[model samples]
Target: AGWNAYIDNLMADGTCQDAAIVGYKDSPSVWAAVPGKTFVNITPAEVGILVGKDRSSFFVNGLTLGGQKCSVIRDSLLQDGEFTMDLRTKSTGGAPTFNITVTMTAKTLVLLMGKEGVHGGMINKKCYEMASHLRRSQY
Candidate 1:
């Protein structure tokens, strides 16, 4: 069967979340896969407050600085595996480009900010600070 059919079967068996296939910039992707079924879900907005449009602006849960669009992933499945999120400002005069990643397990989430040429490499200070803020907000 095709990839969609395989995913459908997983969802039907409660092995994964009910997911929808999507196309972004001509690249096909899937969203809302059940936790542990995939390393990351590109469509994290469906599962949590990662990315979404609100009142003509976009808000990312862990990353600060609003924009016209954004992307996030919940890496709660990867033990000691680091994942990075990149953000570009919607306007020229807004904020610098930024990136952040979180390492996670079933019990704890560790937030890390990208440093100059390290980790995810050279993320904006604003994004790094926002990530630090969200780390405290976690329960």
Candidate 2:
């Protein structure tokens, strides 16, 4: 609740393009957190690989963001995954500074939710298991 508070809202409207979500950029050549939060968005092409602690999962009782509301989603009440989040697409501003447009959607699928999620936590074990399986088989 204290960490990823607004993410559910960002994910709720399907995508928050017009929404004023925060993103921190010191460079377009790489990735950085949106500053002091675990919710960041990266572009669709996945450049700059901006990995950080912006991806930590915690439990939620209830939440509201930008006037949208989320239900308790279950009889037991939960939402969990190998989940950490970010904004998308690509942009540039200067050598050490850049601009990124962060649009988040609820149903989007992504990869490398571990090492690529910037220092991810609250990870569901399935991701690592799958990674290991793929590595073992692919090798």
Candidate 3:
């Protein structure tokens, strides 16, 4: 109930990080959620494409960039109108540790690493890639 339970709170708050969607550029498909349930199961869905398998290299070894090991600190969850995920990578050397958060809606998916600062920002390239893939793929 640790990581999983935390996600339940994140979405129910009715507001997520605004910068989480700043760079989002994808056109997403409408996804309606069923009420009453505390969480939505995305295991049935092919999410590797949705979140970028390259980042996790999850299908292979856990390495991201450099020697960092990527892992899910909090699993994926969905609330009324949004989806959120928490993933992190431990640095092997002097490389920066990446604590990544993904926030998604029918309109777009966005990613943020750590706190936003003048030197740090978000990544929405995955959103565009996912949208393009979603457009062509059949569920």
Candidate 4:
């Protein structure tokens, strides 16, 4: 059998290039056998933020004056530790292509669970109400 599929550029922005699920292995089953079943339906996406760009050491887009080490994306999947990630990136950037792979797990500007996860903004509020909820759940 063969695996049927439906692919679309879910990002809806002009950036994805040569990006698609090359392999999907999540079971004891080997790939390309018995038309794999769907369990986790998240296809691949080449979505990446621009970190740095370089065609060569001898070019116009090189050499800065002050502090210059390497440009990096501050908010990235590697920052959050709640999800699994498999990054497929190219060490060599195409002469006209980007050299970064962005995997977004979550934005941590909000709460996660309980009082602290939900009411993360009201850090100054007294812990009485929050503590009371926890005490009640114990009974």
Off by over 4 Å in 3: 1-47, 51-69, 77-82, 115-139
Residue 63 in model 4: lDDT: 25
User: What is the Cα-based lDDT of residue 41 in candidate 4?
Assistant: 22
**Once model 1 is optimally superposed onto the true structure by TM-score, how far is the C-alpha of residue 37 displaced, in angstroms?**
33
Best by lDDT: 3
TM-score against truth, every candidate: 0.27, 0.19, 0.36, 0.22
Error of 4 at 93 (Å): 11
Worst 10 residues of 2 by lDDT: 70-79
Per-residue accuracy of model 1 over 90-123 as CA lDDT, tens digit each: 3256554333443222222222223222323333
Would you list the C-alpha lDDT of every candidate in the order shown? 0.32, 0.26, 0.37, 0.22
Off by over 4 Å in 2: 1-44, 47-124
| lDDT tens per residue, model 2, 25-70 | 3332212232332223334223222232322221143222222222
lDDT of 4 by residue, 1-139 (tens): 1221211221122322212222322221211211222212222221111112221331323322111112221223234331222222222444222222222212211101112122322221212222233234431
How do all the candidates rank in terms of TM-score, highest first?
A: 3, 1, 4, 2
Question: Who is ahead in TM-score, 2 or 3?
Answer: 3
Report per-prediction Cα RMSD to one decimal.
16.4, 16.8, 14.5, 17.4
RMSD of 3: 14.5
Question: Ten residues in a row with the worst lDDT in model 3?
Answer: 37-46
